[PDB]
Each structure stands twice: as structure tokens, then as C-alpha cells.
Amino acid sequence: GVIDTSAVESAITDGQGDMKAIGGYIVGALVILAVAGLIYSMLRKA
Numbered sequence: 001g002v003i004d005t006s007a008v009e010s011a012i013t014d015g016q017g018d019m020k021a022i023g024g025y026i027v028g029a030l031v032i033l034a035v036a037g038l039i040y041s042m043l044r045k046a
Contacts, residue, residue, distance in 0.1 A: 005012075
């Protein structure tokens with residue numbers, strides 16, 4: 001082991017965990033880009 005992964009549990013959660021936010025924040029932001037694409041297509045198309 002528990003202690004062996006003790007540091008990892010904290011470092012992993014802090015770093016690894018932060019991954020969810022990075023992926024989500026990044027993937028959650030991409031939605032904005034896509035919105036524009038379709039928006040332009042519909043407006044430019046139409």
C-alpha cells in the first residue's frame with residue numbers, strides 16, 4: 001504494498017487524475033470548434 005503505491009496514489013491522482021480534466025477540458029472544448037464548423041457550413045452552405 002500500500003505504501004509502495006502511496007506516493008503513486010497521490011502523484012497518480014494529482015497527475016493521472018488531472019488527465020481526465022485535460023482530456024475532458026480539451027475534448028469538451030473541441031465541441032466549440034465543431035459548432036463553428038457546422039455553423040459556417042449552414043451559413044455558408046445556405
